[PDB]
DNA sequence: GCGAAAAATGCGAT
DNA sequence: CTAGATCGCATTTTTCG
DNA sequence: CTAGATCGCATTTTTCG
DNA sequence: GCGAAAAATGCGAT
Ligand SMILES: Nc1ncnc2c1ncn2[C@@H]1O[C@@H]2COP(=O)(O)O[C@H]2[C@H]1O
């Protein structure tokens with residue numbers, strides 16, 4: 190619709206399965222717009238480990254956190270999860286775009302409000318829950334949002350235990366030791382591809 | 387300027403220290419703008435624990451995360467830390483003050499801008515750092531906000547060991563038990579209040 | 586600027 | 600193995616009439 | 617106490633030409 | 634739409 194004026198005012202780039210869409214700490218002067226696919230958002234800790242703050246997808250503005258005050262630079266890594274096509278465009282341009290139309294400012298603004306929410310619940314989650322109850326939370330959230338292939342008795346996921354650990358905050362060998370517990374209990378199913386029965 | 391206009395249509399109220407401005411859960415439909423004083427945004431889980439996602443001062447907007455979708459709930463309690471002056475409009479109303487002047491829709495979104503970058507880091511200090519690290523990062527965090535009186539060396543923050551905990555996630559005990567030595571380490575000294583960078 | 590009362594802290598071996 | 604979490608109510612420490 | 621973390625490497629599983 | 638190659642897993646006494 191309105192978001193139609195934008196799409197054809199930006200570019201279409203190509204990034205394969207693993208390219209790092211944007212890197213931490215590098216003066217933000219352009220916002221991406223995932224056309225097809227899904228990137229993942231991550232910050233890391235001195236010793237090297239990563240944590241997956243979020244999983245953006247098909248139609249989510251990216252790297253916006255700075256279109257509002259020059260002098261800023263990245264705050265997280267974004268590496269394409271699948272095959273992603275990103276709609277590139279500078280901040281200034283995009284800016285003079287808003288003066289033409291307002292509506293388009295009223296879109297991501299939301300996007301960045303829905304995240305401010307979720308993330309609060311991640312702190313709500315990381316501090317009010319022990320790893321078990323957190324893996325349960327994270328499986329549901331992945332049984333939700335797209336890509337979760339339907340299955341006979343529920344939704345199906347495709348994620349590595351090593352990976353769960355990152356969204357959550359625990360170690361490789363607990364995520365998987367928990368999944369077995371859940372497995373045994375009959376809450377889900379497991380095999381490199383888990384089903385959240 | 388582009389705000390006196392914004393306050394033009396904006397019933398304004400004076401809330402007293404410690405008053406609940408907003409309930410986490412309640413149906414959301416009104417915006418707010420703090421023209422004086424300051425609040426604190428906090429979440430709390432059923433067994434009774436609480437957390438401080440942040441403190442909000444003058445110029446800050448509050449309860450604006452339901453402003454984009456019809457039918458959200460207020461995502462967290464907000465309680466005046468002092469006596470505030472708060473202006474309100476009403477969602478439906480705001481949306482109109484936008485079409486006619488989309489600028490007032492900017493300032494706000496550049497706020498959340500930051501708020502997201504910030505609350506984001508909360509998540510990262512929490513899963514990455516130890517209670518200590520998170521106190522060291524908390525002391526400085528506060529040591530530089532609208533209320534840090536200048537001490538000959540560094541400055542004088544004013545806080546209780548329990549606020550810290552709420553901001554950190556650990557206990558009333560472990561905080562001090564963890565503050566004593568951080569003091570013996572000789573970077574700061576406490577006693578009812580604390581001074582950052584030697585005292 | 587003095588109190589009584591309301592709050593905020595400290596203990597530690599599990 | 601290690602970081603923190605805890606509980607009953609005695610104390611400093613703070614608030615404001 | 618009690619929830620979680622580690623490490624070196626045989627197996628398994630999943631990925632990529 | 635096979636297979637070597639490259640990643641993810643499972644173990645526990647501490
Ligand atoms: N908590 C979050 N939830 C979702 N997306 C985020 C979050 N934090 C950062 N990002 C995204 O990651 C991007 C990294 O670059 P920017 O800081 O430009 O903008 C950031 C956002 O688009």
Ligand SMILES: Nc1ncnc2c1ncn2[C@@H]1O[C@@H]2COP(=O)(O)O[C@H]2[C@H]1O
Nearest residue numbers: 309439448449450451452460461462505
């Ligand atoms: N993570 C956060 N950081 C700062 N403020 C927040 C956060 N989460 C919620 N809030 C604020 O608290 C308000 C609670 O109600 P709303 O969701 O309407 O709007 C929310 C924001 O104004």
